[PDB]
């Protein structure tokens, strides 16, 4: 597994973050192989899970959809990201996966699992054990949060990943149902003087709460898999929230409706762009085929960045540095993905959605974004004070910018940013455990 090899995709908010942990008597290499082989079935169609009772999040109301997953192993520290959950819910891990090989009792294991991770929505674990006891077979069969698989995850992985979908989707439904009544304070209002306010180095209430509620409803719809409904929610959430003269949340609403277009093209569905997004963002209403998509999304991202910048002078409704920097990286990776193909074919869309590079392809002539606009955009990362955030996030910027420069063929700038990465890594009071990623990094430098 790799720790300093981040490269966020433009459709990252659509991903469902999942934590995976080595229950029992695993070893490093074997567990790495197990999780790596497990991270190959994150494209499960919605047309194979049994329906859920409620109508909002029912799988059996949209035959298409993919319901992505994002397998992460590093447990990011809480108590700082907790504030910016009301702002957008695609941060918190929604499911834990236990890979257990010890022939232990599932009930107590699951109980302690939820004890150690109380803030989670739905824990569940898979028994990667070689021929467990037949007495344990019925015990695992009767309970829904527990599954069984052969060593290195090849027995019934399709059915397991089919069942987990509904298993956490019902819990997500319960979460949203308990969550729809909250007043939805801005992250600055929640955290106070605890989150950096993106230091650069370059009927007014109910009409606002209603728009914010619709925005998060659409965001949850996007997370679940209902894409057309998510867009039909974002149109209301963005028009009402632009009428009320609110900038911070409007940026995220415009973000979400921008992400919806990527996946709608990925599924291959015909859809008309809404009127309102055209009004608040010039084309420079109309079917997507009769309008260039990547340049439209570049303009939408520029407008989002404009609103984020315009939302800095407010004392408590400011954009955190984390959201700003990750959006910059997100759009930068979108730019680099666009700069690998002569046209916006399905190959580049699959590459950006599925997180696969296939680097050093034959360069075409006249790409979408030429190789100066991308560098000009990437320079914007240095425009903000990097050396104040936590090291965990700080290495993300340097690593993904190194990847960007490597893709662009700017090896010398890759050396520069990697040197900055090492300087940051060395300068930290907290000690760090050894990992082969550092070995590969030094080898590359």
């Amino acid at each position: 597994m790799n720790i300093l090899k981040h490269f966020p995709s433009y459709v990252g908010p659509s991903k469902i973050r999942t934590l995976v942990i080595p229950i029992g008597h695993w070893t490093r290499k074997e567990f790495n192989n197990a999780v790596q082989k497990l991270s190959e079935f994150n494209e499960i169609h919605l047309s194979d899970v049994t329906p859920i009772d409620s109508p909002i999040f029912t799988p059996q109301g949209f035959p298409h959809g993919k319901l992505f997953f994002d397998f992460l192993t590093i447990d990011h520290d809480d108590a700082l990201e907790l504030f910016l959950y009301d702002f957008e819910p695609f941060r918190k891990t929604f499911v834990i996966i236990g890979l257990v090989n010890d022939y232990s009792d599932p009930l107590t294991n699951l109980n302690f699992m939820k004890e150690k991770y109380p803030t989670l929505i739905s824990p569940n674990l898979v028994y990667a054990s070689s021929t467990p006891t037949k007495e344990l077979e019925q015990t695992i069969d009767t309970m829904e949060n527990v599954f069984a698989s052969s060593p290195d995850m090849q027995k019934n992985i399709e059915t397991i990943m089919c069942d987990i979908a509904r298993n956490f989707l019902t819990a997500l439904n319960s979460y949203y149902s308990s969550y729809k009544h909250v007043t939805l304070r801005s992250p600055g209002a929640i955290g106070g003087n605890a989150v950096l306010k993106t230091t650069l180095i370059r009927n007014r209430s109910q009409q606002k709460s209603l728009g914010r509620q619709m925005k998060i409803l659409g965001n949850f719809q996007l997370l679940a898999g209902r894409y057309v409904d998510a867009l039909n929610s974002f149109v209301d959430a963005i028009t009402t929230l632009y009428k009320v003269r609110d900038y911070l949340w409007l940026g995220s609403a415009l973000d979400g409706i921008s992400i919806c277009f990527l996946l709608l093209s990925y599924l291959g569905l015909s859809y008309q762009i809404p009127q309102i997004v055209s009004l608040i963002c010039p084309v420079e209403n109309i079917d997507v085929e009769n309008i260039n998509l990547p340049l439209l999304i570049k303009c939408i991202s520029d407008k989002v960045l404009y609103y984020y910048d315009l939302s800095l002078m407010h004392n408590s409704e400011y954009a955190p540095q984390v959201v700003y920097c990750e959006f910059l990286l997100k759009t930068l990776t979108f730019m680099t993905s666009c700069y690998k193909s002569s046209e916006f074919s399905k190959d580049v869309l699959d590459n950006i959605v599925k997180n696969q590079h296939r680097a050093l392809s034959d360069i075409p002539n006249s790409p979408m974004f030429p190789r100066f606009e991308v560098y000009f955009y990437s320079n914007k990362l240095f425009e903000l004070q990097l050396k104040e955030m936590q090291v965990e996030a700080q290495i993300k910027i340097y690593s993904t910018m190194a990847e960007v420069y490597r893709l662009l063929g700017y090896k010398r700038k890759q050396l520069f940013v990697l040197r900055l990465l090492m300087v940051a890594l060395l300068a930290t009071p907290n000690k760090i455990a050894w990992h082969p990623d550092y070995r590969t990094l030094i080898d590359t430098i």
Binding site: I3, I21, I23, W26, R28, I74, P429, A433
Partner: peptide, 22 residues
């Protein structure tokens, strides 16, 4: 070596493989 030794140790259960903060 260190790679050949840490590549077959026993990870603690109920914990992430890697952690960043102290």
């Amino acid at each position: 070596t260190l790679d050949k030794y840490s590549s077959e140790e026993i990870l603690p259960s109920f914990e992430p493989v890697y952690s960043w903060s102290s």
